[PDB]
Each structure stands twice: as C-alpha cells, then as structure tokens.
Amino acid sequence: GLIVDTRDVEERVHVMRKTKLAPTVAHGVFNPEFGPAALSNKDSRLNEGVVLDEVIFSKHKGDTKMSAEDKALFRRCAADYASRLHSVLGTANAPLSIYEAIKGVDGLDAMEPDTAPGLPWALQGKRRGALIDFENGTVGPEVEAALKLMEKREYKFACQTFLKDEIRPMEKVRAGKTRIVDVLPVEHILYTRMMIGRFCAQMHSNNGPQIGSAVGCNPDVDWQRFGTHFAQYRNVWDVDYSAFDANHCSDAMNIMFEEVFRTEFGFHPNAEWILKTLVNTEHAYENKRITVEGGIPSGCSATSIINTILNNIYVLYALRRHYEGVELDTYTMISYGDDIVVASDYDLDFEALKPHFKSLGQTITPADKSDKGFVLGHSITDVTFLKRHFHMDYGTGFYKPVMASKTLEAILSFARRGTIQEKLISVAGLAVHSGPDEYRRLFEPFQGLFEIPSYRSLYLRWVNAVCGDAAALAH
RNA sequence: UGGGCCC
RNA sequence: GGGCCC
Ligand SMILES: [Mg+2]
Ligand SMILES: [Mg+2]
C-alpha cells in the first residue's frame, strides 16, 4: 500500500529477535542455500549497510488509483465472480454465534487458544486465554465491549508487526527481505469469523476450479482432482506475483467487499464493514506507528480467502480489459492466496496482460524461471502450485504432489529445539512422493538417531488416501 | 500469525 | 502441541 504517515511514539512494541530455528544433523550433509530469516538489525549474515527496518516496508510502493471505467469494469467482474461463487455455495451466510466462531464448524477449524492476542493486549501481558474462554466458547468483558463497538461500527484498532521467523533462501536472508506478520487483535478475528465464518466454511468444503479456490484442500488427495482437470486444457500458465498482499489497491478491495459480501447474498450488514477496516490500517513496529492505505494485513481472519477471491477477479478483469467477450467459461483457474494456476484452450497472451494487472498495481511475471515472457503449450506437469509439482505416479496412475529436493533438504536442515522427531514424521508425508531412492537419501543423516517412517508405510497410506478403490484393487 | 491441510 | 503450504 501507501505509507501516508510515520509517527514516533514513546510506547515501544518489542519484536521477536533471535531465531528459534536451529540447524539439524542434515544441515552438515546437505548444506542448503537456505537459512533462518534475519531478525536483528545487526545480524552477522546481513549485507553491509542494510537496515532491516527499511526493507520490511519497501513492499509499500503506493496505493494505485483506478479510473471510473476500470472501477466499473472491476465491479462488473467482482459481481460476475460473486454470482458463480454464491451460486455454488448457496446463501446461508448469516452470522456465526460467538461459540461457533471460537470452536469452528464443519469446514472451519477452531481459533488457536494460545496464539498472539494483538493490540492493545500485548502491552498488558495478556494471553488469549485471559480474554476468551476457548473451552466454553465464551468471551470476557474486554472482548464483549469491543464487540459492542464493532456492532456500532465505531471500533478502532492497530496491527502488531511481527518478524516472520522462517526458513528462507540465503539470498533473501542476505538482502534482509524478512517477511512480516500483521497480528490483528483477537476480537477482530473473532468478529470477522462471526461475519463471514460460514461463508469461509462453505468455501473450504467446495474447493476446486469451479470456484477457483484451493483453500481447504489436501494436496495428497486433491492433486488427482486438480491434475486431471488442468491436463484437459491446451495451455497452462504458472503466474507469479510480487508482493500480492501489499499491492491490493483500496479501489479493488473496497469494490470486491461491496460486491461479494452483499446482504442479498445472506450476509449481515457488518460483513462488508469489518472487511473494509482492513483497507486503511495503522501498524505498530517498535517505536514507530505507521499508517498505510491499501494492501491486506496477514493476521486477518480469511486473509487467504480474500486473496483468493481477489486473484479470481483480477484474472477476469485483466482478460476483459484486453479482449472482448471474455466470460468465466473462457478459462479455468485455481488459486490459494497469491499462488495461481491458470488454463485455457484459447491461446491467451499473458505477456500483453502485464499492463492490465498494473492498472490494479499488480506485477505478473512468469514462474517458469526468469524466461523471456509467458509462452504457450505448457501443461500441468510443468507448473508449481503450493511448492508442489504435478507428477504421475508410476504404479497407481494418479497425480501426486512432488516438492523439489532442494526445498525438502532446506526444510529438513532446520528445526525448533525438541520438535525434530515430530517434524521428521510430517515431512516424511511430503517426501514420500519424491520416490523410494530420494526418500532414502533425504532421511539418510537421521538414520539411527530418530524414527524414520518406512517408504512402504506412507505409500500405502497415500494410496488409500487418494482413493479407497485402488488400495482394495491391489487385493 | 491468519485461512487451510497433516500427525 | 508440533510440522508444511499460503
Ligand atoms: Mg485464531
Ligand atoms: Mg506459482
């Protein structure tokens, strides 16, 4: 977005310095070009003269303004996508009860009982369990008074900036390109879940290209469903964005919320309101308070769904700005936030679409390396979605999600102290698709020191997961 | 850390 | 309570 004001206040909000990610035995074997993100201004691995505070907010390069015609076109696209979306999901979008918003429903997982509470509770030393009863599904006086203000639409808040402690390519670690989490207040997440939680539940349940959303998917079983779909098409594109989250313009966000979350679609009048509070935001980072116009905070409830929805509308908007007669049947797409796979039988020109995404403030680039522009003919077996390739399983004849070995090495090279055994078992569930030999190699530095699931046990587990039939057919 | 999915 | 993706 656009940074409009940078206040210096006396109250300092501390951020998590020093990584909790420790090198594992595998790090010495694989030596990956990956490492924990820089968390301190004077980190020894940082490039000379690089101030960490400056790089964090370098993504904020302006809140791009749209003309009336682009806004009317956008409204049209948001309405058209909203039509398809609500046609599939239905219109049972009435507010969730407090109990349901805390504990979740079918499709929506419960709120995390002991994550960050946000502001101003962070300045009071309070955990989430001090404000909200997660077992009973009830809230205390503080949250209830805040819910009263949100009912009245008078609620004001700030976002707590957190440095994302994560494994990153050493280039971005050296560039100081640490990603940040905008931690929102716990009552905000609660109310957003009350306003749009049922909608979010229905989205997860109905994931697939029909609604253009992979939010709620299980790549183990759904790679078959998505894989067969996109292979059916002449052209497939792996479209990359740069700072997709931050570059959502206030025009696009506002219109999207107005078109998708209308009361005629079953929503409470405040669904549109609570989401609109995400457009213009105040962020607290240490000594500085930074006011931003545009972009989406990451700690928001439904941030992935909002991003997914926007992604769908962007692609429709771009094509309609360049071509005539472009409808929702003209192409097919799946997304998960910024991650996107597009396909069509029309030889569409995504290189020509670049400026049309720029009118929304988005920069599209080919994922297929730094190759000279978007090209045609590419299939689903060439693209990457959710850091996973689409690869045919020799034996079963099903698509499987395959991660790059360099990434799997990176993941296995670092762990939070004491979580290493548990990490190995979950990552095994990812590594199984790389094949028996590569599976053996990835866990080779761990043999004798930990329990490593056999290749056979996870392969038979995956076979049953993707389909109960072929597992029984093997008998 | 939010919206998943997995143990 | 972890891990992955986003
Ligand atoms: Mg939560
Ligand atoms: Mg991609």
Side-chain angles (χ1 to χ4, degrees), chain A residues 98-134 136-153:
Chain A
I98 294 161
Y99 184 89
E100 282 178 314
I102 296 166
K103 301 271 280 194
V105 287
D106 296 326
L108 183 72
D109 185 37
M111 285 170 69
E112 281 288 348
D114 208 28
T115 37
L119 295 176
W121 327 117
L123 309 173
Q124 291 169 189
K126 288 180 182 170
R127 313 93 43 200
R128 281 185 166 204
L131 296 147
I132 296 166
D133 198 328
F134 287 82
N136 296 33
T138 52
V139 301
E142 300 93 345
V143 180
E144 204 201 338
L147 292 181
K148 187 185 173 185
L149 296 170
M150 280 181 275
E151 284 170 329
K152 281 182 165 71
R153 294 186 181 191

Side-chain angles (χ1 to χ4, degrees), chain A residues 190-262:
Chain A
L190 217 210
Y191 198 72
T192 306
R193 278 170 75 101
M194 286 166 75
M195 288 303 103
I196 67 157
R198 205 166 278 147
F199 167 78
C200 293
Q202 281 287 281
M203 279 209 73
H204 303 151
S205 296
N206 293 277
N207 75 78
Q210 181 77 216
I211 65 164
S213 185
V215 188
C217 85
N218 181 356
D220 260 22
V221 323
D222 295 322
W223 245 231
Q224 173 64 9
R225 186 162 50 92
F226 307 156
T228 55
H229 183 87
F230 290 97
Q232 220 181 302
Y233 290 86
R234 282 181 76 258
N235 300 297
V236 183
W237 296 271
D238 202 342
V239 182
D240 272 354
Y241 287 101
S242 70
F244 184 77
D245 272 40
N247 291 299
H248 294 305
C249 76
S250 49
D251 292 346
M253 286 171 74
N254 281 310
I255 293 164
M256 188 280 266
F257 298 144
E258 282 160 9
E259 289 311 308
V260 176
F261 300 90
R262 301 183 75 77

Side-chain angles (χ1 to χ4, degrees), chain A residues 154-193:
Chain A
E154 280 165 299
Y155 179 76
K156 308 263 197 166
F157 69 93
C159 312
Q160 200 181 184
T161 315
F162 267 50
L163 287 164
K164 198 156 165 62
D165 183 32
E166 59 179 354
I167 180 74
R168 297 225 75 195
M170 280 304 293
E171 174 163 324
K172 289 188 173 181
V173 175
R174 253 129 38 191
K177 284 188 193 294
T178 308
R179 296 193 287 163
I180 52 100
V181 185
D182 314 287
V183 178
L184 267 64
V186 70
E187 65 270 18
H188 192 282
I189 296 153
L190 217 210
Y191 198 72
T192 306
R193 278 170 75 101

Side-chain angles (χ1 to χ4, degrees), chain A residues 238-240 338-341 367 383-387:
Chain A
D238 202 342
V239 182
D240 272 354
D338 63 303
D339 217 341
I340 164 75
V341 170
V383 302
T384 293
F385 190 56
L386 314 170
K387 294 190 86 66

